[PDB]
Amino acid sequence: MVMSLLGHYNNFFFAAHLLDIAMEVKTLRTILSSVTHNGKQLVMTVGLLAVVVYLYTVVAFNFFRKFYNKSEDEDEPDMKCDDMMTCYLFHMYVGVRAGGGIGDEIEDPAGDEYELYRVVFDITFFFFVIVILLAIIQGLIIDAFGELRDQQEQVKEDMETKCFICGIGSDYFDTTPHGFETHTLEEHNLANYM
Amino acid sequence: AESILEYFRPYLGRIEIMGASRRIERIYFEISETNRAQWEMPQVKESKRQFIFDVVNEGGEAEKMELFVSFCEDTIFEMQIAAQISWGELEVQRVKFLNYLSRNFYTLKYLALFLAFAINFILLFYKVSDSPPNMVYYFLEESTGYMEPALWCLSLLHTLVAFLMIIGYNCLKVPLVIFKREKELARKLEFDGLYITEQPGDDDVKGQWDRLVLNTPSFPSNYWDKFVKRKVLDKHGDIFGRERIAELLGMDLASLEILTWLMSIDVKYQIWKFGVIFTDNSFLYSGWYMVMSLLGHYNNFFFAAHLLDIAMEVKTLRTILSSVTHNGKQLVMTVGLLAVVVYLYTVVAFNFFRKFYNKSEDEDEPDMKCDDMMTCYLFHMYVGVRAGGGIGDEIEDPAGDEYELYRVVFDITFFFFVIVILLAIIQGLIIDAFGELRDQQEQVKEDMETKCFICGIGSDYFDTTPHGFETHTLEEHNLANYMFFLMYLINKDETEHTGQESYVWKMYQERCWDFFPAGDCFRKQYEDQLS
Amino acid sequence: RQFIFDVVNEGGEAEKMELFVSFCEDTIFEMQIAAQIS
Amino acid sequence: ELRDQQEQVKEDMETKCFICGIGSDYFDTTPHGFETHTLEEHNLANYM
Ligand SMILES: Nc1ncnc2c1ncn2[C@@H]1O[C@H](COP(=O)(O)OP(=O)(O)OP(=O)(O)O)[C@@H](O)[C@H]1O
Ligand SMILES: Nc1ncnc2c1ncn2[C@@H]1O[C@H](COP(=O)(O)OP(=O)(O)OP(=O)(O)O)[C@@H](O)[C@H]1O
Ligand SMILES: Nc1ncnc2c1ncn2[C@@H]1O[C@H](COP(=O)(O)OP(=O)(O)OP(=O)(O)O)[C@@H](O)[C@H]1O
Ligand SMILES: CNC(=O)c1cc(Cl)cc(C)c1NC(=O)c1cc(Br)nn1-c1ncccc1Cl
Ligand SMILES: Cn1c(=O)c2c(ncn2C)n(C)c1=O
Ligand SMILES: [Ca+2]
Ligand SMILES: [Zn+2]
Ligand SMILES: [Zn+2]
Ligand SMILES: [Zn+2]
Numbered sequence: 001m002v003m004s005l006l007g008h009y010n011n012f013f014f015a016a017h018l019l020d021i022a023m024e025v026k027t028l029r030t031i032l033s034s035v036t037h038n039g040k041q042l043v044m045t046v047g048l049l050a051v052v053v054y055l056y057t058v059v060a061f062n063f064f065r066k067f068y069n070k071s072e073d074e075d076e077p078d079m080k081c082d083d084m085m086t087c088y089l090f091h092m093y094v095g096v097r098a099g100g101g102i103g104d105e106i107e108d109p110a111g112d113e114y115e116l117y118r119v120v121f122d123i124t125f126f127f128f129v130i131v132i133l134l135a136i137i138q139g140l141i142i143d144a145f146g147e148l149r150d151q152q153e154q155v156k157e158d159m160e161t162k163c164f165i166c167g168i169g170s171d172y173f174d175t176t177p178h179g180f181e182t183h184t185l186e187e188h189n190l191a192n193y194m
Numbered sequence: 195a196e197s198i199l200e201y202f203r204p205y206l207g208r209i210e211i212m213g214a215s216r217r218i219e220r221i222y223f224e225i226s227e228t229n230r231a232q233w234e235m236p237q238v239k240e241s242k243r244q245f246i247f248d249v250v251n252e253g254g255e256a257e258k259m260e261l262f263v264s265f266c267e268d269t270i271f272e273m274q275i276a277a278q279i280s281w282g283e284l285e286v287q288r289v290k291f292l293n294y295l296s297r298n299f300y301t302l303k304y305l306a307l308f309l310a311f312a313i314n315f316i317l318l319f320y321k322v323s324d325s326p327p328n329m330v331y332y333f334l335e336e337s338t339g340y341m342e343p344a345l346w347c348l349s350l351l352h353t354l355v356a357f358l359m360i361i362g363y364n365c366l367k368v369p370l371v372i373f374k375r376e377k378e379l380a381r382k383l384e385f386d387g388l389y390i391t392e393q394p395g396d397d398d399v400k401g402q403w404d405r406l407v408l409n410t411p412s413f414p415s416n417y418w419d420k421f422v423k424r425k426v427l428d429k430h431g432d433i434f435g436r437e438r439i440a441e442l443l444g445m446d447l448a449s450l451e452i453l454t455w456l457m458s459i460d461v462k463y464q465i466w467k468f469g470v471i472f473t474d475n476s477f478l479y480s481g482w483y484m485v486m487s488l489l490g491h492y493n494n495f496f497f498a499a500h501l502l503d504i505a506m507e508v509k510t511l512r513t514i515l516s517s518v519t520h521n522g523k524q525l526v527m528t529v530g531l532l533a534v535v536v537y538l539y540t541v542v543a544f545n546f547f548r549k550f551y552n553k554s555e556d557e558d559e560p561d562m563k564c565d566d567m568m569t570c571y572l573f574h575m576y577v578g579v580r581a582g583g584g585i586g587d588e589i590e591d592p593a594g595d596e597y598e599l600y601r602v603v604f605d606i607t608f609f610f611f612v613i614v615i616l617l618a619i620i621q622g623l624i625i626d627a628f629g630e631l632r633d634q635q636e637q638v639k640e641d642m643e644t645k646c647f648i649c650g651i652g653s654d655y656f657d658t659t660p661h662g663f664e665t666h667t668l669e670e671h672n673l674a675n676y677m678f679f680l681m682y683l684i685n686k687d688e689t690e691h692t693g694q695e696s697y698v699w700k701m702y703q704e705r706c707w708d709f710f711p712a713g714d715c716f717r718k719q720y721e722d723q724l725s
Numbered sequence: 726r727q728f729i730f731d732v733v734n735e736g737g738e739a740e741k742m743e744l745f746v747s748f749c750e751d752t753i754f755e756m757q758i759a760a761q762i763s
Numbered sequence: 764e765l766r767d768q769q770e771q772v773k774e775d776m777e778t779k780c781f782i783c784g785i786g787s788d789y790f791d792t793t794p795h796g797f798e799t800h801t802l803e804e805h806n807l808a809n810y811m
Contacts, residue, residue, distance in 0.1 A: 044510040051501045054314070058498045065322065084334055085318045100580030119576065126580055135621045136514055143628045151734045158733045164745070167657055194749045255777065256798055626766070643738065650791060664739050712794050 030148070038144040042137065049133045053096060056125050057088045060102075064118055067107045101126035164190055204230060207675040210716055211709050213697050218711070218719040220670075221694055225678050232273045233674065241269065250641045251634045259707050262647070266677045271373055271416075275366075295358055296366040302359050306483075309352040310500040316345050317494065349490055352497070356487040363480050368471060373416045375470055379404055380414060380422040385705065389442055390430040403469050409444045410463040424452075479506075513631070520627035525620065532616045536578060539585070539608055540570045547601055550590045584609035647673055649711040655718070671711065781807055 006013040022028050035042075060068070061081060068090075071078040080090040094105045103122030109115040161180075162169045165188040170180040202224075209221040232238070245265050249258055279293045295302070319341060321334035335341045382388040389408065394401040407413050414420045423443045431439055440449040471477050489496040505511050518525075543551070544567055551573075554561040563573040577588045586605030592598040644663075645652045648671040656662030683691070683699055691699060701709050717725055728748050732741055779786045780797075782805040790796035 040510045041514055044508075045514055048505060048511065048514075051504050054501065055498055058317075058495050061322075062493075062495060082322045084321050088318060099582065103576075103580065119572070123576070131617070131620055132518060132624075135624055136517065138621065139517060139625045139628055140514070142625055143632065146629065147632075152730075155730050155733045159729065164729075190745075193745075194752070256795060630766075661739060708794070713792060713796075 033148060034141050034145040037147060038140045041140050045133070045137055045140065049096070049129065050092065052129060052133065053091050054088060056095070056102065056121075056129075057091045059121070060091075061087060063114065064106075064121065067109070067113070067118055069107070070105070095125075096129060099126075099130075101130055163188060165193065207672075207678055208669055209675055209679060210670045210711055211694070211698065212711050212714060213694070213709050218714060218716045219694070220716060221679075223679065223682055225682070229678060229681065232276060235276070237276075238269060238272065241272075246642065246647075247635075247638050250638045259710055259712070262673075262676075263707060266680055267377075268370060268374060269677070270681065271370060275369065292361070292365050295362045299359070299362040299366055302355055302362055306352065306355045306359065306500075307503060309348055309355065310497065310503070313345065313348050313352060313494075313497045314501055316341065316348070317498070345494065349494065349497070352500075353484075353487045353490070356484045359480060360484060363477065367476065368474075369416060371474055372467060372470060375404075376407075376414060376417040379407065380417060380419065383408075383426050383443070384422065384429060387430055390426065390434055390439055403466070406466040406469075407463060408442055410460055410466065411444055412460055412463050413444065415463070516631060517624050517628045520630060521623040524623050528616065528619055528623070532579070532612065533575070535612060535616070536574045537571060539604075540567055540574050542604070543574075543585075544570055546597065547589075547604065550592070550596070550601055552590070553588070578608075579612060582613075584613055646671055648676065649713060649715055651713075651715060651718075666715065666717070671715065676710070780805060782810060 003013055003016045022032055065081045068081045068087075069076060069079050081087045091102065095102045098104050101122060102125050103118075106118075109118040163173075163180075163184055168183075173179040173183045205225050205227070207223055207225055209223075210218060211221060212218050249261055254261065279297050319333055319335045321332050323330045323332055333341045333345070383390065386392075388394070388401075389405065394405065396402075414422050419425075423445050426443055427436065427439055427445065427449060436449060440446065483500065486496055486499045505515055544564060548564045551564045552559060552562050564570045574585065578585045581587050584605060585608050586601075589601075592601040646667055651666075653663040656666045679698070680702070683695055683702075686695065698709050701707070732744055737744065780790075780801055785800075787797045790800045
């Protein structure tokens with residue numbers, strides 16, 4: 001209701017109401033439940049994916065501060081490592097979102113100069129931050145899925161097979177023809193105990 | 195008699211042992227308030243949960259029972275320590291201080307964790323300058339009454355707290371360590387003859403660092419039986435010279451004889467002891483944390499190493515990272531292959547496609563990254579692996595004839611393998627590792643939700659009567675009670691032991707764990723009759 | 726359907742029965758409301 | 764898939780006998796039952 005009142009102040013606020021297209025139609029709710037199921041894990045995963053980009057920020061600084069720099073004009077400034085957080089930023093922006101990590105937006109060791117340090121650096125970066133971490137993320141959700149399904153199946157079976165009121169199983173009730181279908185539809189029915 | 199039979203409900207216990215007449219019999223006894231009071235504190239409760247978890251999903255299924263008795267024996271020690279924490283004149287202050295640093299050890303840990311984030315937030319403001327306020331570093335903030343003075347001040351507090359956790363660990367979590375270590379030794383010598391008949395056997399390094407204490411005159415220090423050295427002389431004392439086992443167990447000549455500090459110190463025991471700890475994986479982590487806090491005074495960016503605890507033991511991070519540490523040798527192994535394949539490609543390219551390479555533009559174009567199988571190997575592990583279509587995106591373009599259909603095959607093969615197959619396998623392993631932990635956990639829980647620990651009977655038989663598997667698992671065969679018995683009988687002054695409490699005692703002192711039900715239970719035995 | 730689902734895969738196994746009685750007590754109220762609107 | 768197969772194998776064993784087919788239950792009624800009917804009586808190496 002409040003967003004529908006804001007829709008009269010600026011009509012683009014009516015775009016907020018399309019978020020119901022996620023709330024309770026069963027295919028969208030079961031899909032989004034795989035993401036919600038598993039929260040503190042994920043919100044923590046992302047947490048690590050920040051303390052693992054802060055450390056690649058620090059190191060660089062101390063040593064590789066020249067191998068950086070993103071300008072072209074002779075009077076080249078735009079030094080994204082000569083100030084406070086800019087690097088932490090440059091590492092959470094340009095970095096994380098790429099293919100080979102920082103190694104694709106920072107000069108090129110090539111010309112000697114600690115060559116075998118910026119190689120190690122980059123390869124260690126991309127490998128962790130892009131395989132390991134981003135991988136773990138897809139990992140959690142897939143599991144969360146399998147998880148819901150397992151619960152559901154357990155439910156159904158525990159039922160297809162045994163009684164609610166009492167606890168006897170199908171066997172001791174199926175020794176006779178159509179048995180577990182009587183001791184659960186006539187005798188110990190549920191609706192009737194109500 | 196309901197009032198009475200209720201006031202005394204928390205101070206009674208029902209066991210269900212089987213012995214003598216080959217029949218099930220019930221035992222009743224009394225438990226003090228303090229005996230039960232030191233059981234519901236959170237530290238012991240979490241120990242129960244962890245022990246139950248790692249005995250159903252590892253190699254038990256027969257010898258699980260002796261592990262349970264071993265579980266009781268160490269919680270016996272644990273509860274004694276907790277009771278003790280709740281010139282000349284300075285000794286009263288020092289015992290009160292050591293009891294203080296160990297009484298709240300987990301608050302010192304949270305306070306060190308908060309100071310790591312407080313220092314690292316202040317490090318985001320640094321800045322480099324071409325001249326002073328070449329290569330001059332400044333704290334680059336508005337003066338505030340903050341920044342530089344607070345960065346100086348917090349570096350002392352983090353080092354003080356990282357030092358106090360060494361003392362806090364050494365006076366709380368190391369006693370039990372040295373304990374679970376003497377028992378072992380004094381349990382091999384007698385009922386096996388370790389050094390009296392066989393021999394460590396090299397491989398067992400542990401079983402060697404510990405050939406130093408045997409002779410020590412305080413071997414059974416943190417261990418109840420200060421007589422072990424005399425039960426081995428009495429046993430393996432004939433088949434082996436009574437004057438030969440009268441050495442590798444100290445008691446030198448004792449066979450016949452059957453301020454402070456600096457003044458009395460078994461130099462040789464202390465040595466042994468020290469060794470035992472510089473190898474505990476929890477002590478080495480605590481030592482590293484302190485060392486990095488000292489390096490934090492040489493260059494303040496070393497305090498960024500302490501943010502790695504944000505992975506070590508908060509439960510969402512630990513369960514997430516545990517999916518990566520499971521399947522270790524697998525992963526590393528995979529990468530190994532991903533380095534042989536990109537080599538079986540280096541060898542190839544070279545021989546033929548060495549011109550299709552080259553990464554220069556100047557007329558005098560050199561930068562030929564294929565004039566050495568070394569550089570080629572790098573160019574293939576650098577530019578290559580990390581891309582979208584593999585080498586095919588950083589190496590000219592077949593197009594112009596020249597083996598066109600060879601560099602096509604090359605690239606497409608390289609690509610498909612190294613980027614689908616391999617990188618895929620990696621994500622594969624971790625996901626599985628996940629499913630793996632969950633399965634174990636579920637197994638644990640269920641095996642429990644459903645069956646008994648002491649014996650092995652299942653729910654069914656029990657659930658025949660209303661709420662069956664909640665009594666035979668909450669009264670009779672309870673677990674906590676098969677433990678309070680021990681502590682009880684240990685106090686009961688012998689001469690006043692009953693009949694059943696003397697069958698168990700003699701069976702405890704001789705390690706014959708056959709007094710546990712295992713397979714049966716009153717209800718079953720006395721079925722027909724009534725119970 | 727929803728009640729049956731969330732009593733087998735959570736912490737029942739003993740006290741499930743009082744939940745069932747609690748289930749009946751609220752559907753008792755529900756049916757009374759529907760009568761008052763028709 | 765491979766893991767499932769492996770687990771099945773192990774368990775089918777941790778739990779039941781090879782020569783005959785009786786399970787752990789009918790054997791564990793007594794103390795350490797199965798660990799006997801699979802290490803003394805119906806051992807396998809011995810039928811060899
Ligand atoms: N009291 C009971 N005791 C044992 N089993 C029961 C009991 N009530 C239901 N069941 C189990 O659930 C099944 C019957 O559920 P039913 O399909 O009637 O519920 P429903 O989905 O509301 O019905 P409908 O499909 O008509 O909507 C039976 O197979 C039975 O095994
Ligand atoms: N001696 C036993 N024999 C059979 N089952 C047992 C035994 N001890 C515990 N259990 C099983 O474990 C459950 C009781 O565990 P309980 O929850 O009391 O441990 P806890 O988690 O330490 O307790 P709390 O939840 O109060 O911390 C019961 O459902 C029971 O089936
Ligand atoms: N004949 C049998 N009948 C039933 N179970 C058997 C039989 N043989 C082996 N087993 C099962 O396998 C297990 C014994 O296998 P064992 O570990 O001895 O094989 P192994 O791995 O060759 O031995 P080791 O571990 O010494 O190499 C027992 O737990 C038992 O249940
Ligand atoms: C497994 N690491 C350790 O042993 C450890 C060792 C030392 Cl010397 C210092 C700290 C802060 C350590 N880290 C923790 O001890 C810790 C990190 C997180 Br996140 N939570 N957490 C914790 N766990 C329980 C109670 C209080 C806390 Cl603070
Ligand atoms: C003397 N004694 C014992 O005999 C004992 C014990 N714990 C188990 N036993 C058997 N403790 C702590 C003990 O002091
Ligand atoms: Ca007496
Ligand atoms: Zn029924
Ligand atoms: Zn039991
Ligand atoms: Zn058999």
